[PDB]
């Protein structure tokens, strides 16, 4: 279990080649919907990985955006544009990876079959090396946070943005739902396997907001 995460990182040269291969596959896989992508949509996705996601995801996680002013209006437009673009880009199905910090109080509740809801966009990489990079440092928090590495089985919702762009990046629109399939907690690490699920198909389980820790529904 979680073998891909547990093994040593591959070399920079190998990771770079794998990322190039993925970019090439992504470009080769554009479908008829790609024809309808607009200049603003292309630009928005190109800006996403670099800087766009930081403000967009803060907006999506915010309890209150009264201080945002025109920045809130711009954030809403940007979010709408990226979502529209995603639906015109190739789907990716298979395994991908993400690292994030999760409240210990939430982690202590989680079981197989529970559903995690991400309020922000969800960014994953098909390369575990890349996922490990983005969760090394510990945020300032009054609540204990733990580093979690996710192994994501994607069967819906994920679109590659690597053809327009982080290496081998597969993005989900906000509010993506992920059902827990396996958990490995040791004194040293926490790994969670999840599978993409449709929100409307989620029944008689417990849903949690992955960022706030709060129960959903």
UniProtKB/Swiss-Prot annotation:
InterPro entries xrefs: ADP-ribosyltransferase
Asked if the keyword Ribonucleoprotein belongs to this entry, the reply reads no
Instruction: Determine the domain of life of the protein's source.
Output: Bacteria
> Mind telling me which Gene3D superfamilies this protein's record contains?
Toxin ADP-ribosyltransferase, Chain A, domain 1
- Put simply, this protein is called Putative NAD(+)--arginine ADP-ribosyltransferase Vis
Name its cellular compartments: Secreted
Tell whether Protein biosynthesis is among the UniProt keywords.
no
Pfam families for this protein: ADPrib_exo_Tox (PF03496)
* Single GO MF annotation: nucleotidyltransferase activity
Record function comment: A probable mono(ADP-ribosyl)transferase, it may ADP-ribosylate Arg in target protein(s). Upon expression in yeast cells causes cell death.
Q: What class of enzyme is it?
A: transferase
């Amino acid at each position: 279990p979680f073998d891909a995460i547990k093994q040593p990182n591959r070399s920079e040269e190998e990771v770079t080649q794998l990322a190039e291969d993925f970019k090439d596959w992504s470009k080769a896989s554009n479908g008829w919907r790609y024809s309808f992508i607009t200049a603003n949509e292309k630009e928005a996705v190109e800006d996403f990985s670099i800087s766009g996601y930081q403000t967009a995801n803060d907006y999506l996680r915010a309890t209150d955006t009264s201080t945002w002013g025109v920045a809130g209006a711009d954030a809403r437009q940007y979010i709408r544009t990226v979502k529209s673009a995603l639906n015109k880009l190739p789907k990716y199905k298979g395994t991908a990876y993400r690292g994030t910090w999760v409240k210990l109080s939430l982690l202590n509740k989680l079981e197989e079959g529970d559903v995690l809801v991400e309020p922000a966009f969800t960014s994953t990489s098909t390369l575990p090396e890349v996922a490990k990079r983005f969760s090394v440092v510990h945020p300032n928090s009054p609540q204990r946070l733990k580093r979690v590495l996710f192994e994501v089985k994607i069967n819906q919702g994920g679109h590659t943005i690597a053809g327009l762009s982080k290496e081998a990046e597969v993005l989900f629109a906000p509010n993506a739902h992920f059902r827990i399939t396996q958990i490995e907690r040791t004194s040293n690490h926490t790994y969670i396997g999840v599978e993409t699920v449709k929100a409307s198909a989620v029944k008689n389980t417990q849903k949690y907001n992955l960022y706030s820790g709060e129960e959903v529904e």
